[PDB]
Design a binder for this molecule. Sequence first.
Ligand SMILES: Nc1ncnc2c1ncn2[C@@H]1O[C@H](COP(=O)(O)OP(=O)(O)OP(=O)(O)O)[C@@H](O)[C@H]1O
Ligand SMILES: [Mg+2]
Length: 246
Amino acid sequence: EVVMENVTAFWETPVLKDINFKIERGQLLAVAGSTGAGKTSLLMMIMGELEPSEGKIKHSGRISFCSQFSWIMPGTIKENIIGVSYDEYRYRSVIKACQLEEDISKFAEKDNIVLGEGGITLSEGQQAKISLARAVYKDADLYLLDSPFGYLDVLTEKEIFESCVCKLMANKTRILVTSKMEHLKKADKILILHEGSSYFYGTFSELQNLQPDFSSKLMSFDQFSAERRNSILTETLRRFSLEGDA
Ligand SMILES: Nc1ncnc2c1ncn2[C@@H]1O[C@H](COP(=O)(O)OP(=O)(O)OP(=O)(O)O)[C@@H](O)[C@H]1O
Ligand SMILES: [Mg+2]
């Protein structure tokens, strides 16, 4: 469980302001909003790299964080995912749901291929999948997934969101930062951020009803690139003011 009550915070204008939400056990919070809105900072705060200046974060547990920038340790594919604690059944289910089995089978050494300076040189998509695999393999109470689908094509991102984030991780408490509407449509609750504050918290069906013009703007949106979706989100969110647009 994660509880946020009237939370505000600034780094070093506050980065986050008046945040209020409660996520139940085994629920999926999809977070979306404009660039610089505080999305990653929200995660940083759950991880305790950011002290709240007001309000209380009622949380305790082991957290696993997948960052939005992929990274790779020198060592094998298996090692990059497992670290040093190995369970065969867990491992298998994670590489399956993160769609790595095909990638792995294409190598002679399979998941014992060594990566790094003397390494095979992996695609951005592969590295993203391994990074997510590492985060999902870690046994944790809370999964914080910050835009993990970055360099994947539409089908692969889809199969991972469904098999991993929704199916395999069904009983975990997770927060996913995303700009994909389909992911919002599937989440238990969504949170829309802009300039530090929440402009919606609730369900996707609920958002469509309470802010029909806002929703109308974001619906073939998912067929745009990550950059264009974040640009569209940002522009629509900027309309929340007293100013005249364009
Ligand atoms: N570790 C940090 N130390 C100091 N300031 C930070 C830190 N991380 C983020 N910020 C600042 O906080 C603001 C919000 O950044 P944040 O990464 O939380 O937004 P975001 O919504 O995740 O952005 P994006 O979606 O474009 O990656 C930015 O203006 C940034 O400069
Ligand atoms: Mg971010």
